[PDB]
Design a protein around this ligand. Structure first.
Ligand SMILES: [Mg+2]
Ligand SMILES: [Mg+2]
Ligand SMILES: [Mg+2]
Ligand SMILES: [Mg+2]
Ligand SMILES: [Mg+2]
Ligand SMILES: [Mg+2]
Ligand SMILES: [Mg+2]
Ligand SMILES: [Mg+2]
Ligand SMILES: [Mg+2]
Ligand SMILES: [Mg+2]
Ligand SMILES: [Mg+2]
Ligand SMILES: [Mg+2]
Ligand SMILES: [Mg+2]
Lengths: 4, 128, 233, 44, 63, 225, 124
RNA sequence: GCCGUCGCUGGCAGUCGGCAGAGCGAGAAAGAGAGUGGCGCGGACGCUACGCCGCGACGAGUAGGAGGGCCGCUGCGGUG
RNA sequence: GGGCCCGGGGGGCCACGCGUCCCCCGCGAGCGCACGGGGUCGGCGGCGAUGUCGGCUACCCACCCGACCCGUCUUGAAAC
């Protein structure tokens, strides 16, 4: 989820 | 117009000469067929240096190219016309070799069929 | 529709970049680049329309087929191979042929073609070696160079320009009737004009060096007491 | 002898090797700096 | 050369039944399939017992 | 439907793509911490000798824990007591090599088989060259070449040895699971000594080859591996 | 059953032929002619055969109907396909696939029905 | 590199195809489970399972033992 | 030196999200390149019909190294  | 095989790999043979029998040269009663020498003081079965050699299993041929003639085809003895249709779905990997006894009247109508079936014959000019 | 950009890190050594993974991330500014989320054809006929099928099924199936083969990665075609060249060979360097019909003949190296073959031409009026290709392995690079930087070698002297052309004259019915042997290689007026043009620029520079033309006219050959490993050429 | 098998087994050797190449080009640049500051110490 | 001893290299277990009947050589096919394709060590024992000689699988009594 | 089963299978194919990035990151920061370990264990062995030379005393370094044993004789004419020990050292073949941790019960075997082996204290570079180039694992009782970390993790994983670097660290720094790590390694098969032995039949102190050549085992490893 | 009478026919048949390290079979409806459980043309409940047409041209296809199983006379059905080289290789293909009739034999049937077309052209 | 023996008491009946969905090499005991509420009609080979395929290790030998011989000789019942 | 080189005031990091509670103070798509699960060329050139191309084996000959005559009893046989 970190790269959204 | 040669009938090429499916694939023609490189054939490598670990030995070409025959395996002559010990002392098959000094005598005529001793044929060239091989017999493993089993005598006590024998110099061949002790594997001395510079002597005759022995058929080990190491000399075996590559299974991929074993029994394979120099034309890239394996072989099959054919005794009559009917034994070709057995060979018509192995066309590009096996060949036919009409037997020695099939007379020339039948061998002509065998090479005739194998020509239509594109089966390769090793002795197609045999008898005539 | 982003314009392509070259690599942002120079290659320190083959397979290793100059910058690290984090350095590359910072350089690329990826911190602000977060992203998240045929065969048939109708054709009229003289009736109705026919759904013509492209690449229809084959009409023959051979009794046996060779199975496919595994996939390699490190093998590339010769056209895509990388062409090496020893540092001892530079434009204007004098080379000696050892295998061609011009055995032991000194020639003036011009450049290297795309394929890899060395495009060389000794003065035709001196050694009779025109513009031709020669493999670098089979040529000895003499340690005698002449400034050839100011020589506009025509661009059309590619590998295709120098590729052989089959005479294609085995026989025919016309030829069997009026036979003319198997033909020859008739030097094209192009290969001749190009040879003359290249010589017109190479010869003035060669003649500047004293005795250089005579040396080129000479032929290298081993003599008694001469060993290649003991003399520097 | 195979860079990417060494990275298949030890992904650290990539930075271990980028170092000691940078570190070496900079130690050879420091040496050529000393040795080209001393050719002006026996010329001055 | 290596200094091993090949005295016991050839394990002597039965790779297959010695009989040639075809109502046993079909059971051994079905159970050789179950034996290799399941993780139940039951089929492996049934298969290993279908090989055994007539003196190693003896009769049972009803009692 | 199958629009559900597709995106589901792609979630599985994404969890199996993140469980690999997390493991490559773990292997990376492990090797990065073993570089630090080896640098410390190297610099402090020089500290502990400079601080003794400043005061005038002597620093006796710790007797080494790890030995590398090489078989330098054939199989033709061995005593039975030396043939049982050359096979509990797994040296069943000339030029075979193995790692051995030292204690009383081990040195007293390397004393029994002394005329048949040439053992010593391996460097860290020698364990690198060995584990990488001649490193084979005894998987399923099969000498399987160690080509990927998933061959070491699959067997020695339960000991938190999951890469060729954890393996090297377990061998070099003799660890709790040394018996298991050293026994996972199929004994190394080394070539003939390039250059050549000095004299195979006499101890190393007799200007020969046999016996213990403590520091100098690495000179032989480089010309044999 | 098939596997039962195959365990009887695998070695002591009369069509079995064993020489030159090869082992073919001369069964009527065996295509590829080789001795195997899969291609045997007498053991199974549904077989396929591709013979040449009795005259010069054409290829006959011999399916074995299901109902008549112990009645050799009314067991096989035969269909002569005297068409071009491609429609016959799309008819055998449909005969087998669209019918779902012994479907592992299809490429064998095409490969044989092509050997026949090839062995019926004018020679060179 | 090739032949062979041994071991893995290894793998393959999954050729599961418009009644289709093409996978089980991956470090971590176990379901690519169910339901219950918030156009173009197409897809190599295989499998004599006593068969085929993959991996490693191994390979001396008299006396002696065992196996495999699509090695050979003569006749018999079948079958080509 | 070690402590993530404890804490305060020019180069390399497999570090780079927002919203808190809190002690320490689960799918982003593409596009290529390759030291990446064992070789390919989408590189070429020469000669070839009455004298030449190929044939390892098989016939004769030459030369270099090796090379004592087999069976047998025997601790031991090329054995005077
Ligand atoms: Mg004797
Ligand atoms: Mg004796
Ligand atoms: Mg051996
Ligand atoms: Mg033995
Ligand atoms: Mg035994
Ligand atoms: Mg000795
Ligand atoms: Mg040397
Ligand atoms: Mg001695
Ligand atoms: Mg033996
Ligand atoms: Mg001599
Ligand atoms: Mg006697
Ligand atoms: Mg006596
Ligand atoms: Mg005497």
């Amino acid at each position: 989820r970190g790269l959204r | 117009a040669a009938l090429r095989p499916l694939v023609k790999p490189k054939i490598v043979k670990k030995r070409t000469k025959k395996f002559i029998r010990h002392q098959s040269d000094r005598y005529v009663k001793i044929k060239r067929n091989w017999r493993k020498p089993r005598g006590i003081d024998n110099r061949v079965r002790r594997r001395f240096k510079g002597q005759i050699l022995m058929p080990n299993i190491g000399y075996g041929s590559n299974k991929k190219t074993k029994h394979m003639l120099p034309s890239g085809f394996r072989k099959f003895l054919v005794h009559n016309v009917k034994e070709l249709e057995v060979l018509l779905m192995c066309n590009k990997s096996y060949c036919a070799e009409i037997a020695h006894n099939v007379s020339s009247k039948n061998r002509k109508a065998i090479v005739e069929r194998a020509a239509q079936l594109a089966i390769r014959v090793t002795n197609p000019n045999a008898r005539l | 529709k982003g314009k392509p950009h070259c690599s942002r890190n120079p290659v320190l050594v083959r397979g290793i970049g100059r910058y690290s993974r984090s350095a590359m991330y910072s350089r690329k500014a990826l911190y602000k680049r977060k992203y998240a989320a045929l065969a048939t054809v109708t054709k009229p006929v003289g009736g109705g329309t026919r759904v013509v099928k492209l690449r229809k099924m084959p009409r023959y199936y051979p009794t046996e087929d060779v199975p496919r083969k595994l996939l390699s990665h490190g093998k590339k075609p010769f056209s895509q191979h990388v062409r090496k060249l020893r540092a001892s060979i530079t434009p204007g360097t004098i080379l000696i042929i050892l295998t061609g019909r011009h055995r032991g003949k000194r020639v003036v190296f011009l450049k290297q073609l795309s394929s890899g073959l060395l495009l060389v031409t000794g003065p035709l009026s001196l050694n009779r070696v025109p513009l031709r290709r020669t493999h670098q392995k089979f040529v000895i690079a003499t340690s005698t160079k002449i400034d050839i930087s100011g020589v506009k070698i025509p661009k059309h002297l590619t590998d295709a320009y120098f590729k052989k052309k089959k005479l294609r004259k085995p026989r025919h019915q016309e030829g069997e009737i009026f036979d003319t042997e198997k033909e020859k290689y008739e030097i094209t007026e192009q290969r001749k004009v190009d040879q003359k043009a290249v010589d017109s620029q190479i010869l003035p520079k060669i003649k500047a060096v004293p005795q250089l033309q005579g040396y080129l006219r000479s032929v290298f050959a081993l003599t008694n007491g001469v060993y290649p490993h003991k003399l520097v050429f | 002898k195979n860079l990417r098998i060494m990275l298949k087994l030890n992904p650290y050797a990539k930075t271990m090797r980028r170092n000691t190449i940078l570190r070496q080009a900079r130690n050879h640049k420091l040496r050529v700096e000393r040795a080209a500051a001393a050719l002006a110490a026996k010329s001055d | 050369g290596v200094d091993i001893r090949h005295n016991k290299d050839r394990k002597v277990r039965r790779k297959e039944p010695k009989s040639q009947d075809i109502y046993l050589r079909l059971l051994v096919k079905l159970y050789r399939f179950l034996a290799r394709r399941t993780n139940s060590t039951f089929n492996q024992v049934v298969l290993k017992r279908l090989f055994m000689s007539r003196t190693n699988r003896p009769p049972l009594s009803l009692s | 439907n199958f629009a559900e089963l597709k995106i589901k299978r792609l979630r599985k194919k994404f969890a199996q793509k993140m469980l690999r990035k997390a493991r490559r990151k773990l292997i990376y920061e492990k090797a990065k911490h073993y570089h630090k370990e080896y640098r410390q264990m190297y610099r402090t062995e020089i500290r502990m000798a400079r601080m003794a030379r400043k005061a005038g005393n002597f620093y006796v370094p710790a007797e080494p824990k790890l030995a590398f044993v090489i078989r330098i004789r054939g199989i033709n004419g061995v005593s039975p007591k030396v043939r049982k020990v050359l096979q509990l050292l797994r040296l069943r073949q000339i030029f075979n090599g193995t790692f051995v941790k030292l204690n009383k019960a081990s040195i007293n075997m390397l004393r029994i088989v002394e005329p048949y082996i040439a053992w010593g204290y391996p460097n860290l570079k020698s364990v690198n060259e060995l584990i990488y180039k001649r490193g084979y694992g005894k998987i399923n009782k099969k000498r399987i070449a160690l080509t990927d970390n998933t061959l070491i993790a699959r067997s020695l994983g339960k000991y938190n040895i999951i890469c060729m670097e954890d393996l090297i660290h377990e061998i070099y720094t003799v660890g709790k699971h040394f018996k298991e790590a050293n026994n996972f390694l199929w004994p190394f098969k080394l070539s003939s000594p390039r250059g050549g032995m000095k004299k195979k039949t006499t101890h190393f102190v007799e200007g020969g080859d046999a016996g213990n050549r403590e520091d100098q085992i690495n000179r032989l490893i480089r010309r044999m591996n | 059953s098939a596997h039962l009478q195959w365990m009887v026919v695998r070695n002591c048949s009369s069509f079995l032929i064993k020489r030159n390290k090869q082992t073919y079979s001369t069964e009527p409806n065996n295509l590829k002619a080789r001795n195997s459980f899969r291609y045997n043309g007498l053991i199974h409940r549904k077989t396929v055969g591709v013979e040449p047409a009795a005259d010069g041209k054409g290829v006959v296809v011999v399916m074995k109907r299901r109902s008549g199983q112990r009645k050799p006379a009314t067991s096989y059905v035969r269909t002569t396909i005297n068409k071009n080289a491609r429609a016959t290789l799309s008819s055998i293909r449909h005969m087998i696939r669209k019918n779902k009739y012994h479907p592992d034999l299809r490429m064998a049937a095409i490969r044989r029905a092509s050997a026949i077309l090839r062995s019926q052209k004018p020679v060179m």
